[PDB]
RNA sequence: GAUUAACCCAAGUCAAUAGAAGCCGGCGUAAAGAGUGUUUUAGAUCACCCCCUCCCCAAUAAAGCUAAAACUCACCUGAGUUGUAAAAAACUCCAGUUGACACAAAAUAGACUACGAAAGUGGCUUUAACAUAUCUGAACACACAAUAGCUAAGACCCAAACUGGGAUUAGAUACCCCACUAUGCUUAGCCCUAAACCUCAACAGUUAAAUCAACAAAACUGCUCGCCAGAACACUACGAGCCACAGCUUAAAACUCAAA
RNA sequence: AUAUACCGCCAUCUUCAGCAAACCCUGAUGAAGGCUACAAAGUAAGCGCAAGUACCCACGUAAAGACGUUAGGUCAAGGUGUAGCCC
C-alpha cells in the first residue's frame, strides 16, 4: 500500500520537485534544501505523485494532511474500486471419486459467486490410463452445474508436456448474463 | 533457605492435595547444565547511525564525514578485538564462577546417593 | 602444503635485521634468538628486498592475472603506471604555475589514493534471524575493504561497455577518475553505502 | 495331493456336538476406589482403659466498600492510530497529556501450604458460621457438585464460540490479523456433566520378616463398603427414571477377532 | 533363466573408528548393561585405525581403510549351484 503521510526528513531521491502548501509550484530542488524549507516554514512533506520521473512532493500542515486523507476515504467508501481478481487453483485427478468431485464443485461455485478466476488442472490418475478426451469431460461436468453462472475464461489446453489439461473459469459478465436470461426466456416462450 | 518440601508432593499419608507436580524427581543430579551462550546483538550501531546520518546530510560524500567515518571504524576495531578478548576469558573462566567441566569433576567426587548401600 | 607446520614464513625486511641490539626490547631479543632455531620457508618468487617493491601493486597485479599469466599481468600493470604518469606530465606542462602545485605526477601516489577513495566503509552481509536471512549493514574489516576496492576497479575495466580500448588505457583512466572522487567505481561505493543506509532499520538483526 | 516308511489306538478308529473340572484373585498405570458427604436394618473391634495441634491463615452465605488498570466525556496539542516473521483489512468525532469516572477482574504478599465433604476458595470490612465424645455404611434415598448449556429480567469495561472481513495455501470451512454476537457477570429457576485424576476408598496399625514383576508416589497388616472378570461392538440399542426433548443416569445382546 | 543361490573383483557410508573371540561383573540371574584418573567393574587376544613402506623429507600425495549397511553392481571376465534347451 501507499499511504498519504509525512515522508519525513529523509527523502529517497536527491532531486525533488516541490510544491507549496497553497499549491504554488516551487520547482525542482535538492533534498537538503527541502529539509531547510520544512524547518523554516514548520511544515511536513508529503508525496503527491510518484509516477512522474521528477519526484513530486508537496509541503503541507498536519491539519491539511488529515483533510486530504479524509477526502480520499470518502471517495473510496462512496465509489469503491473493484479489487484485483484473485486466482484460485485446483488440481484434480482423472479417477477422482464422485463424492470428492461434488465437494470441489461446490467449492468452485463459491469462488465464482465471489467473482474469482478458477484455474482447474486435471492430471492422469495414479496407475490409470486415460485419454485427453475423457479428462476434458470433467470440465464440462463441473461447468454443467453452473449453467448461467460460469463460463470458460480459457478453454481446456494440454500442458505439462501433455500429461494434464488446464482451463480457467470465470463469472459471466452482466452483458453475458442478460443474454443467457434472454435466450432462456425465448425458449420458454417457444415452449 | 530452600523452600520447604514437607507435604508438597502427592504421597501416601499426605492428606492435602499436592502443592507441586514435578515432571522430574526432585533429586540432585551429579552434573550441572552447560554454559548457555548469550544471544548475540548488534554493536556499534550508535556510531554506525552517526556516520550514516552525515552521509544523508552530505550527499554520501565521505570528504565531509571523515571524523564520523573514522569513529565508526574505531568502534568496530575495538569491538572486533572484544570478540577475541571475551572468548579468551570465557574459556579461561576469568569471569565465570567456575567452569561446568570444573564444577562437574568436583561433583563426580561427591555423587548424590539416592539409594542405600 | 609440502611444508611441515614447523616451517615459519620468511621475514624479508633489511631494516629489521640492521636494527642495533641496544634498541631491542627483552621481548624482541627473545624473538630473534628463537628464529635461529626455527625452520624458515623459502622466499616466494614474487616479493624481494627491492626498494621499488610495493605489496599493493603486486596484489592488484595478481587479481588481474588470468590463468597464471603473470608476465602479461605485470606488463599491463607497468603499462598502466606509465600511462598514468604520461597523462599527468601532459596535464602538468599545459597548466599554470599555480595549478601545477596541485597536480600529482607520481603514479604510485595516484594508484594508492585512487583505491583508498573506493574502499567501502560499511558492508552488507546476509544474517539469519528467526529462520530468515536478512541483508544487514555491517562493519567491514580492513582486509575486506581493500579487496573490494581492487575487485571493483578490475571488474569495471573488464566490463564489455568499453569497446576495443586496451586495459592500460581503461585502467589508467579509471584510476585518475577515482583519484578525483569520480567515475563508476566511486558510484558503486555510494550505492553500497546507500543500500546500507536504506537497511539501517535492519541493523538489529546482526548478532555480533 | 499321491506314494513309501513310520507313529498312536485297535474291532475299532475319532470328525462334529455336548458334558465333565465354575468364586478366599484383584481395583496408581493392564477390567476395576463408582465427583462429594450423610442413614436404617446391620457389620467391625479400630469404642472403657490410654494419652500430644483447641484459636489465627485463601470454607460458606449476606450486606457494604475500592486501590491499580480500562471504557466514556471534556480541554489543549499532534496527523496519523491499530496490526507483525511480514502484510493487508480496520479506525481516523483518531492518538498523546491531564481531570472526572464500573453491576468487570481481584499485582505484590504466596520461596506461604492454609480452609472446605468434594466441587472449590488468595482485594477490604462486618454479621452469621465451619456436623458427629467408637468406626464402616444408602446406585432403593437426601443434600451438593468446575466449565459449558437452557429459561426470564438486567448490567456491559474487557475477553470471546459463531459469523463477517484481511492474509496464507493446491485448497484453509483452520493455524495469523481486525470487527462483533451468544457466553463469561448479577438476580430467579433449571441442567447434573469433567483427565470431577493427587486415576492411589474409609477407619485402625506396622516398618520386621520374603523389601520388591516393571514403571510410578517404598512394602505391608486388620476391618468394612464400593467396584472389576479378553478385546471390540459400547460414554451404543431397548427398557425405566428425570423441570432434562439433538439431554443425562443405569446399560446389554447378535455378528467379529486371537488377540487387545 | 536366477547377481534374490554364489565364488571372483568391486561401489557405498569411509573426507568413518570401530569390530570382537574368550572371561568377569551389574540388573532379585528379564530383554539388556558395564564409565568417572583426587577413578566408582571391567579385562580384553585378534582385526581396522595408527605405526611402517612407495613417491622428493618426519611434510604432502598415494596406498591402506576392519565389522557391517544398500538381497547395491556384475551368471555377458572366467568359474559355478539350481532349473531349462539338445534336428
Ligand atoms: K488484588
Ligand atoms: K503468586
Ligand atoms: K465421572
Ligand atoms: K490428574
Ligand atoms: K556380491
Ligand atoms: K558369471
Ligand atoms: K549360472
Ligand atoms: Mg495462490
Ligand atoms: Mg510425568
Ligand atoms: Mg484402568
Ligand atoms: Mg474418590
Ligand atoms: Mg455415595
Ligand atoms: Mg458414616
Ligand atoms: Mg453445576
Ligand atoms: Mg450461566
Ligand atoms: Mg473486544
Ligand atoms: Mg456480550
Ligand atoms: Mg464481580
Ligand atoms: Mg479438579
Ligand atoms: Mg475415578
Ligand atoms: Mg467409603
Ligand atoms: Mg492409615
Ligand atoms: Mg469385557
Ligand atoms: Mg459422556
Ligand atoms: Mg445414551
Ligand atoms: Mg431411550
Ligand atoms: Mg547382490
Ligand atoms: Mg585412495
Ligand atoms: Mg594406515
Ligand atoms: Mg538386487
Ligand atoms: Mg541404486
Curated annotation (Swiss-Prot), chain B:
Motif (Cx9C motif 1): 44-54
GO molecular function: RNA binding
GO cellular component, one term: fibrillar center
Cysteines paired by S-S bonds: 44-75, 54-65
Motif Cx9C motif 2 location, chain numbering: 65-75
Pfam family, one: CHCH
Keywords: Disulfide bond, Mitochondrion, Nucleus, Ribonucleoprotein, Ribosomal protein
Chain ranges of the CHCH domain: 41-83
Biological process, per Gene Ontology: mitochondrial translation
Intracellular or extracellular location(s): Mitochondrion; Nucleus
Main location: mitochondrion
Similarity comment: family membership: Belongs to the mitochondrion-specific ribosomal protein mS37 family.
Oligomeric and partner information: Component of the mitochondrial small ribosomal subunit (mt-SSU). Mature mammalian 55S mitochondrial ribosomes consist of a small (28S) and a large (39S) subunit. The 28S small subunit contains a 12S ribosomal RNA (12S mt-rRNA) and 30 different proteins. The 39S large subunit contains a 16S rRNA (16S mt-rRNA), a copy of mitochondrial valine transfer RNA (mt-tRNA(Val)), which plays an integral structural role, and 52 different proteins.
Protein name: Small ribosomal subunit protein mS37
Organism of provenance: Homo sapiens (Human)
UniProtKB/Swiss-Prot annotation, chain C:
Pfam families: Ribosomal_S7
Known partners and oligomeric status: Component of the mitochondrial small ribosomal subunit (mt-SSU), essential for mitochondrial protein synthesis. Mature mammalian 55S mitochondrial ribosomes consist of a small (28S) and a large (39S) subunit. The 28S small subunit contains a 12S ribosomal RNA (12S mt-rRNA) and 30 different proteins. The 39S large subunit contains a 16S rRNA (16S mt-rRNA), a copy of mitochondrial valine transfer RNA (mt-tRNA(Val)), which plays an integral structural role, and 52 different proteins.
GO cellular component: mitochondrial inner membrane; mitochondrial small ribosomal subunit; mitochondrion; ribosome
GO MF annotations, alphabetized: mRNA binding; RNA binding; rRNA binding; structural constituent of ribosome
Subcellular location: Mitochondrion
Family: Belongs to the universal ribosomal protein uS7 family.
Coiled-coil residue spans: none
Disease: Combined oxidative phosphorylation deficiency 34: An autosomal recessive disorder caused by mitochondrial dysfunction and combined respiratory chain deficiencies of complexes I, III and IV. Clinical manifestations are variable and include congenital sensorineural deafness, lactic acidemia, and progressive hepatic and renal failure.
Predominant localisation class: mitochondrion
Organism: Homo sapiens (Human)
InterPro entries: Ribosomal_uS7, Ribosomal_uS7_dom, Ribosomal_uS7_dom_sf
Modified residues (N6-acetyllysine): 174, 194
Top-rank taxon: Eukaryota
GO BP annotation list: mitochondrial translation; ribosomal small subunit assembly; translation
Record's protein name: Small ribosomal subunit protein uS7m
Keyword Ribonucleoprotein: yes
Keywords carried by this UniProt record: Acetylation, Disease variant, Mitochondrion, Primary mitochondrial disease, Ribonucleoprotein, Ribosomal protein, Transit peptide
Keyword Membrane: no
Amino acid at each position: 500500500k501507499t499511504a498519504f503521510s509525512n515522508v519525513g526528513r529523509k527523502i529517497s531521491q536527491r532531486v525533488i520537485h516541490l510544491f507549496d502548501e497553497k499549491g504554488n509550484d516551487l520547482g525542482n530542488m535538492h533534498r537538503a534544501n527541502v529539509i531547510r524549507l520544512m524547518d523554516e516554514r514548520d511544515l511536513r512533506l508529503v508525496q503527491r505523485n510518484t509516477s512522474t520521473e521528477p519526484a513530486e512532493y508537496q509541503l503541507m500542515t498536519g491539519l491539511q494532511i488529515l483533510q486530504e486523507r479524509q477526502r480520499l476515504r470518502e471517495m473510496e467508501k462512496a465509489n469503491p474500486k473493484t479489487g484485483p481478481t484473485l486466482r484460485k487453483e485446483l488440481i484434480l485427478s482423472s479417477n477422482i471419486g464422485q463424492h470428492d468431485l461434488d465437494t470441489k464443485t461446490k467449492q468452485i461455485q463459491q469462488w465464482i459467486k465471489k467473482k474469482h478466476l478458477v484455474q482447474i488442472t486435471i492430471k492422469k490418475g495414479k496407475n490409470v490410463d486415460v485419454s485427453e478426451n475423457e479428462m476434458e469431460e470433467i470440465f464440462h461436468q463441473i461447468l454443467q452445474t453452473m449453467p448461467g453462472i460460469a463460463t470458460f475464461s480459457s478453454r481446456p489446453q494440454a500442458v505439462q508436456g501433455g500429461k494434464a489439461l488446464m482451463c480457467v473459469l470465470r463469472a459471466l459478465s452482466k452483458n453475458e448474463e442478460k443474454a443467457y436470461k434472454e435466450t432462456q426466456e425465448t425458449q420458454e416462450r417457444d415452449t | 533457605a530452600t523452600p520447604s518440601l514437607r507435604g508438597r508432593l502427592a504421597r501416601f499419608g499426605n492428606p492435602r492435595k499436592p502443592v507441586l507436580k514435578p515432571n522430574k524427581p526432585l533429586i540432585l543430579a551429579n552434573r550441572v547444565g552447560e554454559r548457555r551462550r548469550e544471544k548475540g546483538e548488534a554493536t556499534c550501531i550508535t556510531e554506525m547511525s552517526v556516520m550514516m546520518a552525515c552521509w544523508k546530510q552530505n550527499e554520501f560524500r565521505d570528504d565531509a564525514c571523515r571524523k564520523e567515518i573514522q569513529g565508526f571504524l574505531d568502534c568496530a576495531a575495538r569491538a572486533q578485538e572484544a570478540r577475541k578478548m571475551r572468548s579468551i576469558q570465557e574459556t579461561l573462566g576469568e569471569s565465570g564462577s567456575l567452569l561446568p567441566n570444573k564444577l562437574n569433576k568436583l561433583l563426580q567426587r561427591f555423587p548424590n546417593k539416592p539409594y542405600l548401600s | 602444503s609440502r611444508y611441515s607446520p614447523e616451517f615459519k614464513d620468511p621475514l624479508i625486511d633489511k631494516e629489521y635485521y640492521r636494527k642495533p641490539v641496544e634498541e631491542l626490547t627483552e621481548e624482541e631479543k627473545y624473538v630473534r634468538e628463537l628464529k635461529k632455531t626455527q625452520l624458515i620457508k623459502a622466499a616466494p618468487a614474487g616479493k624481494t628486498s627491492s626498494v621499488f617493491e610495493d605489496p599493493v601493486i603486486s596484489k592488484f597485479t595478481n587479481m588481474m592475472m588470468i590463468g597464471g599469466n603473470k608476465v602479461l599481468a605485470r606488463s599491463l600493470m607497468i603499462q598502466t603506471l606509465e600511462a598514468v604518469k604520461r597523462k599527468q606530465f601532459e596535464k602538468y606542462h599545459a597548466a599554470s604555475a599555480e595549478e601545477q602545485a596541485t597536480i600529482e605526477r607520481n603514479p604510485y601516489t595516484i594508484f594508492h589514493q585512487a583505491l583508498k577513495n573506493c574502499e567501502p566503509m560499511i558492508g552488507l552481509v546476509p544474517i539469519l534471524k528467526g529462520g530468515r536471512f536478512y541483508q544487514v549493514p555491517v562493519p567491514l574489516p580492513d582486509r575486506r575493504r581493500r579487496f573490494l576496492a581492487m575487485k571493483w576497479m578490475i571488474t569495471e575495466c573488464r566490463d564489455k561497455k568499453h569497446q576495443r580500448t586496451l586495459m592500460p588505457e581503461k585502467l589508467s583512466h579509471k584510476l585518475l577518475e577515482a583519484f578525483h572522487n569520480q567515475g563508476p567505481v566511486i558510484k558503486r561505493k555510494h550505492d553500497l553505502h546507500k543500500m546500507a543506509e536504506a537497511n539501517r532499520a535492519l541493523a538489529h538483526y546482526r548478532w555480533w
